[PDB]
Structures are given as C-alpha cells and as structure tokens.
Write a structure and sequence with these properties.
Subcellular location (chain A): Endoplasmic reticulum membrane
Strand content of chain A: 35-45%
Order of helices and strands of chain B: EEEEEEEEEEEHHH
Largest sheet of chain A: 4 strands, antiparallel
Structural class of chain B: alpha+beta
Radius of gyration of chain A: 27 Å
Main location (chain A): endoplasmic reticulum
Distance between the termini of chain B: 90 Å
Strand order of the largest sheet of chain B: 1-3-7-5
Shape of chain A: elongated
Radius of gyration of chain B: 27 Å
Function (chain A): TRAP proteins are part of a complex whose function is to bind calcium to the ER membrane and thereby regulate the retention of ER resident proteins.
Family (chain A): Belongs to the TRAP-delta family.
Oligomer: part of a larger assembly
Helix content of chain A: 25-40%
Keywords (chain A): Congenital disorder of glycosylation, Disulfide bond, Endoplasmic reticulum, Isopeptide bond, Membrane, Signal, Transmembrane, Transmembrane helix, Ubl conjugation
Structural class of chain A: alpha+beta
Distance between the termini of chain A: 93 Å
Largest interface: A-B, 17 and 21 residues
Chain lengths: 142, 153
C-alpha cells in the first residue's frame, strides 16, 4: 500500500457553455509514496459515482475526467475521493450491500473548485433615434 | 474483444486553443482484456503541445462488457489541415495469449483554424466597448440645439 501519500493536484473545469455541450471536469494528480510503490491502480468517486482513473506516462501521474450537463454543473466545490484497489473493493461491497459508504476512508481527497459556466441592437438604437429625429424634422418644418 | 472509438469533442479546432480528444474503449468479448495499451503517435510535439492527458496509456485489465474512457487535451501550435488518424490499441485476449493489435476510429481530416480567422468568424465585448466610442461625435450640437429651443420654446 502507498504509505503517506503526497499529492500535488491540478484540475481544469470548462468555463464556457457556449462552445461546449457539457461541463467537463479534469483532475490531474502526481502521487508520491514514502515506500516508493509505483504503478498502483487508483479509482475515483465523485458524489457516489465511480470514475476510472488513468495512469500518466510519467510515474505517479494520474488523471480522472467526468462530464456534466451545464445545468447540473453548478458552481461550487466538487470533492473527488480517490481509492486504492482494497478500499475500492470495500466500497463496491458496501454499495452492493446498501451499507454506509462513508465508513470507508479514501486514500486522499481533492477539492475541485468550479466557478460555474449586437449589430441588431446598434441598428435598432440608431433607427429609433433617427425615426424620432425625422418626427422632429416634420414638427420643426410643420 | 475490444471496440474503441476516437472522437474530437471540439466543434472547432483553433490554433493556440485547447483541443480535446476522447478515447472510448469497449470490451465486447466474453473474457477480460489484459495489458490493454493505447498509443497515438499521430501528434508530433512540434505541432501540438500536450496540455492535459496522454497519447500513450495502459490499463492492466478491462472487464468483459465494461468500458474505459480516456481524454487528452492538446493545443495545436499551427493552423492548417490535420489528419486525425486512428490510435493503436494492443491487448491480450487471453492469459499468455498472442497480443491483439486493434485500431480506433479515425475522425479523419479536420481543419485547424488560424486564431485570427477564428476571431474573424466568431468574435462579443467588442461591441460593448465600441458603443460608448461613438457618442462624442454629436455631444456639442445635441446639447446646444435643445438648450436654444428651451430658451426660445
């Protein structure tokens, strides 16, 4: 097992709902262990949904990503809980048993702060002001 | 038996902007695929900066009737036409079996728009700033005309 996990998290969240259909969350972590155990499999849980965690090309780099509808990707902090194989197996057992999933400690957690996701008007304003100017001209000449 | 798809999630590829590639691998076989490796050498680092994700990824096991999704965020450094070729996937169909080599779907040739051309086609706040800039042209006569009218009407 990884003893004393030291993590450096880096995360990205889609900010713009005009060019994307769904809000994508990307969390990269570098993991270093005191016992220098490498190439462990990690599993992520976000709000009780489990997502596969990939291993980076570099040793100890891991990435998890999930997407949410812009309506459901509310602004706020999303806690990503990472589990090892053993704790992940326990989590899957508790979930199958409808046991309290909170009893099972994650290996570490990462807080992802999500902030959330003219020419017609210019013509209209110029048109209205010009039209009233035309009315003014009529009254002036009337 | 693994089925894999490569998709480009961006509606527009733009020079200097993030380009998101998603790889979805589906095990449709009756057994688990072992030592599943995905490699996509199609993106030379001289033309694409890796912002997030990996072109090379390995999974120890994919359970039967299960799937894995991998996402890579690249940044194209040059505008032009680029061919999003298929990535290569290798896996073992059985323990001590032969390595099976598969390929993902190929999205095909996509155009990377130059940043200037993207802005020309899709560039908001410009009008917000521009609106005020037009006012000064008529400041003097606009006030004077009514002031004189009021002094005589």
């Amino acid at each position: 097992a990884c003893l004393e996990p030291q993590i450096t998290p880096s995360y990205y969240t889609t900010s713009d709902a005009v060019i994307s259909t769904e809000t994508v969350f990307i969390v990269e972590i570098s993991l270093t262990c005191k016992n220098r155990v490498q190439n462990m499999a990690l599993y992520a849980d976000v709000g009780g949904k489990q997502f596969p965690v990939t291993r980076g090309q570099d040793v100890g780099r891991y990435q998890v990503s999930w997407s949410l509808d812009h309506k459901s990707a509310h602004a706020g902090t999303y806690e990503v809980r990472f589990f090892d194989e053993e704790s992940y197996s326990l989590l899957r057992k508790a979930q199958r048993n409808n046991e309290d999933i909170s009893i099972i400690p994650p290996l570490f957690t990462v807080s992802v702060d999500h902030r959330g996701t003219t020419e017609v008007l210019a013509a209209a304003i110029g048109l209205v002001i010009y039209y009233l100017a035309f009315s003014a001209k009529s009254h002036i000449q009337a | 038996r693994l089925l894999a798809s490569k998709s480009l999630l961006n509606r527009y590829a733009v020079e200097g902007r993030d380009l998101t590639l998603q790889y979805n691998i589906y095990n449709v076989g009756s057994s688990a695929a072992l030592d599943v490796e995905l490699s996509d050498d199609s993106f030379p680092p001289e033309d694409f900066g890796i912002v997030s994700g990996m072109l090379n990824v390995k999974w120890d096991r994919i359970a039967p009737a299960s799937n894995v999704s991998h996402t890579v965020v690249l940044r194209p450094l040059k505008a032009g036409y680029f061919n999003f070729t298929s990535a290569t996937i290798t896996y073992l169909a059985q323990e001590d079996g032969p390595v099976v080599i598969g390929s993902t779907s190929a999205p095909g040739q996509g155009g990377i728009l130059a940043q200037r051309e993207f802005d020309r086609r899709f560039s908001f706040l410009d009008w917000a700033a521009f609106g005020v800039m037009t006012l000064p042209s008529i400041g003097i006569p606009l006030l004077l005309w009514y002031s004189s009218k009021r002094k005589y009407d």
